[PDB]
Symmetry: D2
Subunit: 198 residues, 4 copies
């Protein structure tokens, strides 16, 4: 049974970068719905699987990927942010960024571009390519999860669905991108990165 995880901070902890109304709706409504729907879908898949009903398993894929992915994505997203975040990472993660993108600032331009480049709903990601052994930027549509659809280990995700920023920045997604850099929990991203050094 999946559950809506608790945020590591209060709804207004990311102000003024991401306002309180967005955090509350995003978490209590959007993420919550993904969780509730995911549980129903999984139960239905178990029933279809037990019956060897292939058509039913196939028909359930859209809801499983969408809500299952949404659960994966938002859960990671909350840990990627912090009221004590911002600045730049340090140590091995910082060195990997320089090595793979030239500089931290160049990395920001790249992740920003991937995030701004999404037409429609989606996510921008900084990931780790296990076979190439280096960092890699990628964009995902709707709620398609990074690992489940590309194989890359997610380290940092940026939600660019309109509900992630509209109330505060309206149509100007770029302003939202410039703002979010102020609340990134580089400690969490670093931990996720080191988990790859397994």
């Amino acid at each position: 049974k999946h559950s809506l995880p608790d945020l590591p901070y209060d709804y207004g902890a990311l102000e003024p970068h991401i306002n309180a109304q967005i955090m509350q709706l995003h978490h209590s409504k959007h993420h919550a719905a993904h969780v509730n729907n995911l549980n129903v879908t999984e139960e239905k898949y178990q029933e279809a699987l037990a019956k060897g009903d292939v058509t039913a398993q196939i028909a359930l894929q859209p809801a499983l990927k969408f809500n299952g992915g949404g659960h994966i994505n938002h859960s990671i997203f909350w840990t990627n942010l912090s009221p004590n975040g911002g600045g730049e990472p340090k140590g091995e993660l910082l060195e990997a960024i320089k090595r793979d993108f030239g500089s931290f600032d160049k990395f920001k331009e790249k992740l920003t571009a991937a995030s701004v480049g999404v037409q429609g709903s989606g996510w921008g990601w900084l990931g780790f390519n296990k076979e190439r052994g280096h960092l890699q930027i990628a964009a995902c549509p709707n709620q398609d999860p990074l690992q489940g659809t590309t194989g890359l280990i997610p380290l940092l995700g940026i939600d660019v669905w309109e509900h992630a920023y509209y109330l505060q920045y309206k149509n100007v997604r770029p302003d939202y991108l410039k703002a979010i850099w102020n609340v990134i929990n580089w400690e969490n991203v670093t931990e996720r990165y080191m988990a790859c050094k397994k």
Copy 2:
């Protein structure tokens, strides 16, 4: 050269169903952006086409469909709404609705379902299948335009991108859908339908 058409009414003409801030942003920003992006992309295609640069033509497709589609969809959308709208259509359109969907209410349930069913950004459409000579409902992702991607002639469209309802209804897309029926310009939908019968 494509141009941003003026709305058929003022920004606040659709209150309280779709508020003034939504109408103004939707038209002055989202649609406005599609129009220029479309014109720039077409001029770019003209140059690639002239040079027989196939890679260039292919790389421009996402922008052309997204903004070209954005222009087509929103242009139809404004005409589909009216401060004097609402109610039910009459004549041949209504009879086709009864014939193809059973009743006006059943049709409403079906278009609402298709619209509510869009995962991510998209549109819900009531269209006309010229091949079969009857009505047909369909959903399109992002800005993919109905006729250009399915062959169906657009009669009535419902924008379900979060920017079309979020500032007012937040995450409750179903409440937006319920509200929009109050401003449907059935005169315009009937016109588009009869034109398929020219």
Copy 3:
């Protein structure tokens, strides 16, 4: 579990419309591989579901849809053909074909077009739309199954993957489509169609 069904005829029973080597490979190798891969994938999904591993479920979707779809599609296809086939259906099925497509010949022109119109691998289908209560022609990419991805009930399928015809007709898919009508099992298609009106 799932197992490879036996053909309702010998591998060379559809000559000279579809030669023996194609029937043999298509059934004993292609469909066979789909079954074996399906069983393995279902087992993997059962494990991922039990552990609540959503990423694993997502990652397995491509293999599940492709091989599960492959098993579904080929199983129907074998029953849709017969050495004692060809001609035209009768009774209610023919009645619906005339009503929904104008005539049997127009129907053939339409399904033929949808089949030849597949760019890449896929299938052409004559299905039944339960909601609208009438026939509907649709095309599906790769092994995506008709009902699982469109909701339409499959009645007659035309495999347009190159392995369904290349050994005999090479690149000329139209020649293959022209020939297959000589072996369509209208008894089976009528049976499927009657099962829908229940």
Copy 4:
């Protein structure tokens, strides 16, 4: 106006790795049809563009990408092969492969996996990522061209559509992949790679 490029060798020049029947059909029929379809589509697109018909432009995208990509892909493919090729590439290309994939053998395994991994019709590619300045392996569906859809510069392509191997290898695609390494034109692959060093 686009034209079918002559092969750099005779149809039976790649025996016994890729027989003469496949080479003749692949070039004179498959590639040839893409060229014709491309010219016809480009012309129709020019007509639509001139009249500002956005719907017409969108409707033509599938045929343009499919046949334009087809022309791009096969044109590169022909130059990627040679009766005097095979073995390992000489010069910097090999050092780059060692750097980015560990060794030549590892490189072959990955490109083979990416090629065998295509479900349905498609291509396997060894490309060059200009932004990251290193080699990168990717797979593309149907005829979607590498540079046009991913931005990666094509260096070596492996056609895995069934028409590229079925007449000779039937369903055993892995045997086709094994055999193709014997005719790789590393001179051309290096030529394409050096053009990326700029």
